[PDB]
Amino acid sequence: PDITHEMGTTSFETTPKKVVALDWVLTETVLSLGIELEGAANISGYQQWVAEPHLNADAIDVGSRREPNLELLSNIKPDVILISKHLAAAYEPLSKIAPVLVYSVYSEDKQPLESAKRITRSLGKLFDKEQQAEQVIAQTDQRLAANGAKITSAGKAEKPLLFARFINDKTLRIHSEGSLAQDTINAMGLKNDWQEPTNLWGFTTTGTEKLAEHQKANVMIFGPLSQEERQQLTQSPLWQAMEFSRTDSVYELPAIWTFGGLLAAQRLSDHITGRLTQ
Ligand SMILES: [Fe+3]
Ligand SMILES: [Fe+3]
Ligand SMILES: [Mg+2]
Ligand SMILES: [Mg+2]
Numbered sequence: 001p002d003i004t005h006e007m008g009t010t011s012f013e014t015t016p017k018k019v020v021a022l023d024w025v026l027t028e029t030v031l032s033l034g035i036e037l038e039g040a041a042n043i044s045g046y047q048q049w050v051a052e053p054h055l056n057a058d059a060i061d062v063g064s065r066r067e068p069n070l071e072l073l074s075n076i077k078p079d080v081i082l083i084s085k086h087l088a089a090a091y092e093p094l095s096k097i098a099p100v101l102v103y104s105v106y107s108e109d110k111q112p113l114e115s116a117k118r119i120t121r122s123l124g125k126l127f128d129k130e131q132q133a134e135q136v137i138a139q140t141d142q143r144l145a146a147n148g149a150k151i152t153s154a155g156k157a158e159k160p161l162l163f164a165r166f167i168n169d170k171t172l173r174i175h176s177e178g179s180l181a182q183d184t185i186n187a188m189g190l191k192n193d194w195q196e197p198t199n200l201w202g203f204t205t206t207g208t209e210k211l212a213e214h215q216k217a218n219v220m221i222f223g224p225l226s227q228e229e230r231q232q233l234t235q236s237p238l239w240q241a242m243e244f245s246r247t248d249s250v251y252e253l254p255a256i257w258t259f260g261g262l263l264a265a266q267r268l269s270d271h272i273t274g275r276l277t278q
Contacts, residue, residue, distance in 0.1 A: 004122070005101040005103055006104055007088070007100070007101075007102040012080070015126065015127055016079030016099070016127075018076070019036070019038055019079065019080055019082065020038055020040070020062055020076075020080070020081045020098075021037055021082045022062070022065060022082065022084075022090075023065055023083070023087070024041075024049070024050050024260065025084075025105045025106075025116070025257070025260050025264075026083070027050070028260050029116065029119055029120055029123055030123060030127075031053040031054075031263075032261065033120070033129040034132060035123075035127050036058075036059070037056060037059045038058075038060060039060040039061070039062035039072075039078065040060075041065045041068065042064050043061040048255065049224075049255060050257040051257075052263065060076060062076075065087070066087075068087075068094065070093060070097065073097045073098070078097065079099070081100045082101055082123075083101075083103075084102065084103060084104040084105070084106070085104040101122075101126070103122060103123070105259075106178075106202075110177060111178075112179070112180045112259075113140075113265060116265075117262070119261075120136055120137055120261070121137070140262040143266050144188050145187070147273040148189040149189075151190065151273055152189050160216065161190055161192060161217060161219075161272075162174065162192075162193045162211075162218070163194070164211075165203070165221075165222045166222075166232075169232050170208055171207065171208070172206050172210070173204070173205055173206075173258075174204050174206055175258060176195065176198050176202065176204065177197075177198045177202060178199075178200060179201070180202065180257075180258060181202070181220075182202055184265045184268050185272065187265075188272070211239070211242055212238075212242070214244075215242050215243035215244060218251065219242075219244045219249060220272065221251065221253065223254045224254070225252060251275045256268045
């Protein structure tokens with residue numbers, strides 16, 4: 001019955017049935033184990049930026065990731081509330097409503113894939129889904145290796161990758177050390193063209209002029225992009241001047257969460273493999 005999390009040890013004499021997750025990677029992880037959410041933070045955002053796996057029908061929006069709705073959470077009476085250390089200032093208030101477990105995929109460890117495995121195992125214990133947890137972990141490692149072997153065998157692993165989130169006309173997040181994207185492509189035997197320092201989420205915020213020092217890369221642009229965002233890239237003199245634009249070496253990915261878990265890594269791996277070996 002005793003579960004350890006980042007704020008100590010909690011006992012559950014029955015598996016918690018009504019589950020709230022207050023970040024999207026914990027939402028993804030709960031869903032990865034075949035468990036439904038009573039509530040999740042910012043469902044319209046999860047739908048836009050995460051997309052899969054699909055949240056269950058009856059899931060209630062319990063506030064923003066930064067501002068949980070305490071009145072609503074009190075009314076819906078969860079059996080467990082899942083947060084990261086990024087919401088630790090809400091630990092004691094949420095604790096008055098229900099048992100709170102603290103799990104952080106993104107920490108100063110900067111090993112998101114390994115953290116998501118550790119956390120998939122803890123939540124597998126919490127929900128009596130340990131076998132399902134071990135298979136999500138094994139299938140993640142299987143898919144990365146197999147996709148890596150395919151890309152390498154096709155002679156497509158030699159060109160380095162640049163992973164970019166569009167922020168505005170003049171601003172990008174480039175994903176490298178500590179990013180889900182980097183843990184994924186490292187496992188697939190690919191090279192990151194970005195070697196600048198990153199925050200604990202695994203990205204550097206940069207100007208778009210920095211792309212000029214990375215023209216030999218295959219550029220992967222995270223989805224989704226708005227019509228206005230995509231027109232800004234299509235029409236930008238800077239982007240159209242870059243070698244990767246002239247050599248058809250720019251790929252727009254679908255909506256896959258850059259701060260997601262094992263299922264995000266699986267989907268990102270599949271889509272990269274598709275684009276590089278089509
Ligand atoms: Fe939010
Ligand atoms: Fe964000
Ligand atoms: Mg999140
Ligand atoms: Mg990003």
